[PDB]
Structure formats: C-alpha cells, structure tokens
C-alpha cells in the first residue's frame, strides 16, 4: 500500500504532462506524471503504482502493428482529474488494479475488462459501450452516479460493499451482484434500471442512509506530496566526450555496468549510444547490455525502426514530456525497471537536488 516518494523508484517519472509512445511495455517500478498522463495505444504494464496529477487518458489504436492495452497495477492508480478510456474497435483496454482513485469523472468507453479491488471516485463513474465490463472485488465508493449503458456491465463480486449516490443502467446493460455483495444507493432508481440488476444472493439498500468510505491514507499522501521538492534549475550536466550535448556518469563496479545519461534539452538514443560508448570506453550497438537511466528536461526519442529494449529508468524534469519513436511509430519500447546503484543514485541526487519530504 506504500507509494514511493523518490523519482528514483519510478520506471518512468515525469514532472509535468507525460505522453507515452505506442507499444510501450513496462515491467516493475511505478509510473508518475505531475500533469496530464496520456497513454498511447498498446500499453502493457505490470507496475506497482500509476499516478497522474492531472487528467489520465488511455487510447486505443486499431493499426495491426499495435495491440490491446493490458495494464496491471499492484497497488494504486491515482488520477487527480478525470480518467478516460477511449474506444477504437476492435481493441480492448484491460486494467487490473488493487486501488483506484479518481478525483473527477471515470469514463470507460473502450471495451475491456476493468477489475478493481477498491474503487474511490469523487464524482461519476460512466461505462458506455459493448464489451465494457467492470468488476469490483471488495469495495467501491462513488459520490456521484454509477452509469452503466449501451452494453456495459458491472459485477459486484461476493461480499463486496459498494456505496453510490445513484444508479442508472439502460440500453442492454446489466449490474450483477454475486452472493453476499451489498449495494447501497442514496436514491432510488427508475424501473428500467431496477429490472437491469441481476441479484444473485446479494442485498440492495435503496435510498439508504450510510456513510461513504474514505480513500485510504495513501491517497491524501499522494495528493499532498510535492514529488519534486528541492528540485534545482541548474541545467543537467553535459560533458565534452561523446556527444557534447549530453552528460554521463558510469558505475563499473558491477557487471553489467550502470550508466546515467543526462540531456538537458532532449535525449535521442543514437546520441545516447555515442555518449555511452565514450564513457564506458567500448562499442555499443544497443542497451540490453546495460543498466541505463535517461534523465532529460525535454523529450526522449528512440530512432530505430525496431523494438528498443532497456533496463533502468526514464526521468523527465522538464515542463512536459513525450516518449517518441520516430523509426516507425509502432517500433515499441520495453522497459524493465531497475533501481540505480548507490553511486548513481547519489550522482542524480546531487545534480537535481530532489529531496523527498520525510
């Protein structure tokens, strides 16, 4: 349930708005955006936390070089504003999270399986369209309306507890209660809605007097933490070797070695490889050979036609951040998170000054 305080815990950390590339695969760590977080089609994540301090948007892309979104979050999805899962047939957006909080509206249009242990919304939750299927396994607190339309379904799993102001279900949609599930509604719905509920041994309390569950502590922690406390405005380092526009520090005390690349204005990967080769004193064709940390205040671009595989992390400390693939928008990036070694942690801390609040 703990959410990491330091940008070094993140597979991808963005100070400002984050726009991902298509066919992004992320394994381990967390992902954070201090502004709007736009996830492009074909995201496949298996991460601990996914945080946006703005709007979150999850896109779909029917190009045959693309694929479905499959987002698995072991702890928390946090969205300060609205979450919007867009719809492009015949794609799916599958999301499986322990805890999701959305401060404004949750709008699920793209088909997919959305599975939450606990859901907290400070507004409405709207599912619209064929194949849009949500399951709540334990708890949900929805301060506005739960709207389930146009073929969408919602399943309240056994012994779950769900608290909503209002419920609307119409247009070929269903709300399913499994055994012992408890639904509490502050109001009484219309006839059509009621006849769209399939109650398999649960209980519905209509126009019920109840208190909402409040989001777990972790939520207010995320809301009140300034994730870039202490951040300097010093430009990221550059050095004369390699590419004059980039800087680097290496840790060769392990094998494979670790390296941090700094690009104040941007980083492009073929230029990063020139910096890497110069710093390590050896030829480098790719990155699977290496633990790599890329830190910029501009965009990070992967220029190959093909998939880039890396181990490490990506940190943007600029106002906004795009991960771009210009060889072919579908080239893809696979990122396996790895914590930097202590010397590289210290180097990054020194050059940026981020000091998380204790």
Classify residue 215 by its DSSP letter: P
The verdict on whether residue 239 carries a ligand-binding annotation is yes
Binding to Mg ion by residue 274, rule CB under 5 A? no
Asked if 266 and 296 touch (Cβ cutoff 8 Å), the reply is yes
Taking CB under 5 A as the binding criterion, the range among 111-119, 130-138, 246-254, 283-291 that sits at the site for Mg ion is: 246-254
Judged by phi (left if over 0) then psi (alpha if -120 to 50, else beta), residue 186 lies in alpha
How far is it, in rounded angstroms, from Cα 141 to Cα 326? 42
Taking CB under 5 A as the binding criterion, the range among 40-48, 231-239, 310-318, 320-328 that sits at the site for Mg ion is: 231-239
- Going by C-alpha positions, the residue among 51, 121, 62, 71 that lies closest to residue 91 is 62
The residue among 246 and 294 lying less far from Mg ion, judged by its C-beta, is 246
How far is it, in rounded angstroms, from Cα 221 to Cα 271? 39
- Give buried/exposed letters for 160-182 (b at 16+ CB in 10 A, else e): bbbbbbbbbbeeebebbbbeebb
Q: Of 126-145, which residues contact Mg ion (CB under 5 A)?
A: none
Pick one of 27, 150, 218, 239: the residue that binds Mg ion (CB under 5 A). 239
Residue 344 backbone dihedrals phi, psi, to 5 degrees? -75, -40
How far is it, in rounded angstroms, from Cα 182 to Cα 150? 24
The verdict on whether residue 246 carries a ligand-binding annotation is yes
Q: How far is the CB of 284 from Mg ion (least distance, A)?
A: 14
- Which string of DSSP letters, residue by residue, matches 151-191? T-EEEE-TT-EEEEEEEEEESS-EEEE-TT-EEEESS---H
The verdict on whether residue 275 carries a ligand-binding annotation is yes
The residue among 243 and 301 lying less far from Mg ion, judged by its C-beta, is 243
Q: How many other β-carbons are positioned within 10 Å of the β-carbon of residue 96?
A: 16
Pick one of 168, 169, 246, 323: the residue that binds Mg ion (CB under 5 A). 246
The residue among 125 and 276 lying less far from Mg ion, judged by its C-beta, is 276
Q: How far is the CB of 230 from Mg ion (least distance, A)?
A: 26
Residues contacting residue 212 through CB under 8 Å, at least 6 positions apart: 141, 143, 163
Taking CB under 5 A as the binding criterion, the range among 189-197, 235-243, 280-288, 322-330 that sits at the site for Mg ion is: 235-243
- Going by C-alpha positions, the residue among 356, 341, 294, 335 that lies closest to residue 31 is 335
Q: How far is the CB of 246 from Mg ion (least distance, A)?
A: 5
Taking CB under 5 A as the binding criterion, the range among 54-62, 210-218, 233-241, 291-299 that sits at the site for Mg ion is: 233-241
Asked if 111 and 85 touch (Cβ cutoff 8 Å), the reply is no
Q: How far is the CB of 274 from Mg ion (least distance, A)?
A: 8
Q: How many other β-carbons are positioned within 10 Å of the β-carbon of residue 254?
A: 10
The residue among 11 and 246 lying less far from Mg ion, judged by its C-beta, is 246
Q: How far is the CB of 48 from Mg ion (least distance, A)?
A: 33
CA-to-CA dists, residue 21 to 24, 44, 69, angstroms: 6, 11, 12
Taking CB under 5 A as the binding criterion, the range among 28-36, 113-121, 195-203, 245-253 that sits at the site for Mg ion is: 245-253
How far is it, in rounded angstroms, from Cα 136 to Cα 115? 6
Residue 161 backbone dihedrals phi, psi, to 5 degrees? -135, 120
Give the binding-site size for Mg ion (rule: CB under 5 A). 4
The verdict on whether residue 264 carries a ligand-binding annotation is no
The residue among 25 and 249 lying less far from Mg ion, judged by its C-beta, is 249
The residue among 35 and 242 lying less far from Mg ion, judged by its C-beta, is 242
Q: How far is the CB of 236 from Mg ion (least distance, A)?
A: 11
Q: How far is the CB of 233 from Mg ion (least distance, A)?
A: 21
Pick one of 242, 298, 318, 332: the residue that binds Mg ion (CB under 5 A). 242
Interface residues toward Mg ion, by CB under 5 A: 239, 242-243, 246
Binding residues for Mg(2+): 239, 241, 243, 246, 275
Per the annotation, where are the binding residues?
239, 241, 243, 246, 275
């Amino acid at each position: 349930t703990s959410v990491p305080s330091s940008p070094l815990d993140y597979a991808i950390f963005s100070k400002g708005a984050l726009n991902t590339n298509k066919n992004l695969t992320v394994e381990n760590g967390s992902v954070y955006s201090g502004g709007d977080l736009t996830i492009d089609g074909g995201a496949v994540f298996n991460i601990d936390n996914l945080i946006s301090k703005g709007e979150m948007v999850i896109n779909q892309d029917s190009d045959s070089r693309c694929r479905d979104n499959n987002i698995v979050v072991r702890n928390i999805i946090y969205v300060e504003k609205s979450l919007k899962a867009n719809r492009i047939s015949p794609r799916s957006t599958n999301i499986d999270a322990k805890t999701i909080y959305v401060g404004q509206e949750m709008q699920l249009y793209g088909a997919g399986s959305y599975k939450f242990v606990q859901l907290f919304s400070d507004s409405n939750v709207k599912l619209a369209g064929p194949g849009v299927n949500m399951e709540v396994s334990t708890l949900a607190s929805i301060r506005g309306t739960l709207e389930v339309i146009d073929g969408a379904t919602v399943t309240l799993k056994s012994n779950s507890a769900v608290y909503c102001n209002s419920l609307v279900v119409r247009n070929g949609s269903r709300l399913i209660l499994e055994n012992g599930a408890k639904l509490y509604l502050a109001t009484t719905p219309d006839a059509s809605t009621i006849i769209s509920i399939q109650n398999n041994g649960g209980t519905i309390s209509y126009s019920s007097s109840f208190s909402y569950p409040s989001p777990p502590a972790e939520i207010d922690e995320i809301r009140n933490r300034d994730y870039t406390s202490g951040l300097l405005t010093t430009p990221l380092p550059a050095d004369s070797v390699g590419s004059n526009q980039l800087g680097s520090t290496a840790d060769t005390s392990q094998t494979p070695p670790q390296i941090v690349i700094y690009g104040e204005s941007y980083i492009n990967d073929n230029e990063a490889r020139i910096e890497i080769s110069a710093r390590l004193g050896s030829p480098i064709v790719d990155f699977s050979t290496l633990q790599l940390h890329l830190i910029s205040r501009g965009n990070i671009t992967f220029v190959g036609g093909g998939l880039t595989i890396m181990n490490g992390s990506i940190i943007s400390l600029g106002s906004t951040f795009n991960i771009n693939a210009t060889g072919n928008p579908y080239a893809g990036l696979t990122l396996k998170y790895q914590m930097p070694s202590p010397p590289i942690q210290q180097d990054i801390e020194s050059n940026t000054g981020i000091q998380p609040s204790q």
